[PDB]
Amino acid sequence: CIIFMDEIDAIGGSADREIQRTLMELLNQMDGFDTLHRVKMIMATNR
Amino acid sequence: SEEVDLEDYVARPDKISGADINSICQESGMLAVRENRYIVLAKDFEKAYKTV
Amino acid sequence: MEGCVSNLMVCNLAYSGKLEELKESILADKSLATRTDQDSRTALHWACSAGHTEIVEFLLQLGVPVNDKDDAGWSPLHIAASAGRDEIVKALLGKGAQVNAVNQNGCTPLHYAASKNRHEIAVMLLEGGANPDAKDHYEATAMHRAAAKGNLKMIHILLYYKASTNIQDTEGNTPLHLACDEERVEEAKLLVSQGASIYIENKEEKTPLQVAKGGLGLILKRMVEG
């Protein structure tokens, strides 16, 4: 697998609470149990 | 752990009482499964308490 | 699993109780004792936790500040009281350490002293001019935990300093209520005989007589009128 993510600065920014919750979900998924030695991720952004 | 205090956790939940304590502890385990710290401390517990 | 309790070398060495390697580390570099870990603690805390007298005496001889606190505000005195070591308390109090220092929950070292059921530590701490009537962030004294763990001698030596039993918790539960909840007859009769007011009501509006079961509040009231 190879992951291509373009313009990630949009999602990088109870309205904020759900955003923080999604971020916590991302942390839980990325820091969970998985093998990253194969799958590669690429992130594109602006500033 | 020695740093973990049972006093504040025997005090504050007596004021504000939530459900599924063991589940919250498991959530703290999910906070401690991030391999940032070997021994779980009061920080993860307090965080698990303030988050849910 | 097990392993190092901290990232710093001097802290793990202080926890392992190695005197020669620690002294060598200090002689090599004097800035190692001033370093801070992710837990925001120094070698002194782990040394007081280990229960080694020589190391902490050497550190206190070097003049390391005892007022240093971590992110949770734990003082070395709290750790010393929780460890149940008399000599460490003698050293800290001997260096003029503050007994009014408060942690995250604001619990005085007397609370942890009554929690581990240490008489000598409590006596020595209260001898340094400490206030038994001091309250934490939860507005509770050490008498609460003392009556909760069922310690008669602890409450007794706490009453040797003539500590007030009229302290009211933010919940409204007096130490007498905790004494009745623990179903301790001796502690209840003693506290009542010491002049403790049973007319204090909590947020639940429950008299101490209704708290105790088996007609204990009856003989408590008998001790009140008697």
Curated annotation (Swiss-Prot), chain A:
Highest taxon of source: Eukaryota
Annotated localization: Cytoplasm; Nucleus
Subunit structure of this chain's protein: Component of the 19S proteasome regulatory particle complex. The 26S proteasome consists of a 20S core particle (CP) and two 19S regulatory subunits (RP). The regulatory particle is made of a lid composed of 9 subunits, a base containing 6 ATPases including PSMC6 and few additional components. Interacts with PAAF1.
Cited function: Component of the 26S proteasome, a multiprotein complex involved in the ATP-dependent degradation of ubiquitinated proteins. This complex plays a key role in the maintenance of protein homeostasis by removing misfolded or damaged proteins, which could impair cellular functions, and by removing proteins whose functions are no longer required. Therefore, the proteasome participates in numerous cellular processes, including cell cycle progression, apoptosis, or DNA damage repair.
Family, similarity comment: Belongs to the AAA ATPase family.
Stated name of the protein: 26S proteasome regulatory subunit 10B
From Swiss-Prot, chain B:
Family: Belongs to the AAA ATPase family.
Subcellular location: Cytoplasm; Nucleus
Residues recorded with modification N6-acetyllysine: 43, 47
Domain of life: Eukaryota
Name of the molecule in the record: 26S proteasome regulatory subunit 6B
Function: Component of the 26S proteasome, a multiprotein complex involved in the ATP-dependent degradation of ubiquitinated proteins. This complex plays a key role in the maintenance of protein homeostasis by removing misfolded or damaged proteins, which could impair cellular functions, and by removing proteins whose functions are no longer required. Therefore, the proteasome participates in numerous cellular processes, including cell cycle progression, apoptosis, or DNA damage repair.
Subunit structure as annotated in this protein's UniProt entry: Component of the 19S proteasome regulatory particle complex. The 26S proteasome consists of a 20S core particle (CP) and two 19S regulatory subunits (RP). The regulatory particle is made of a lid composed of 9 subunits, a base containing 6 ATPases including PSMC4 and few additional components. Interacts with NR1I3. Interacts with PAAF1. Interacts with TRIM5. Interacts with ZFAND1.
Source organism of this protein record: Homo sapiens
From Swiss-Prot, chain C:
Localisation: Cytoplasm; Nucleus
GO MF annotation, one: RNA polymerase II-specific DNA-binding transcription factor binding
ANK repeat start-end pairs: 3-36, 37-69, 70-102, 103-135, 136-168, 169-201, 202-226
Record InterPro entries: Ank_repeat_dom-contain_49, Ankyrin_rpt, Ankyrin_rpt-contain_sf
GO cellular component: cilium; cytoplasm; cytoskeleton; cytosol; microtubule cytoskeleton; nucleus; proteasome complex
Record's keyword annotation contains Nucleus: yes
Keyword terms: ANK repeat, Apoptosis, Chaperone, Cytoplasm, Nucleus, Repeat
Biological processes per GO annotation: apoptotic process; negative regulation of apoptotic process; negative regulation of DNA damage response, signal transduction by p53 class mediator; negative regulation of MAPK cascade; negative regulation of NF-kappaB transcription factor activity; negative regulation of release of cytochrome c from mitochondria; negative regulation of transcription by RNA polymerase II; positive regulation of cell growth
Name this protein carries in UniProt: 26S proteasome non-ATPase regulatory subunit 10
Species of origin: Homo sapiens
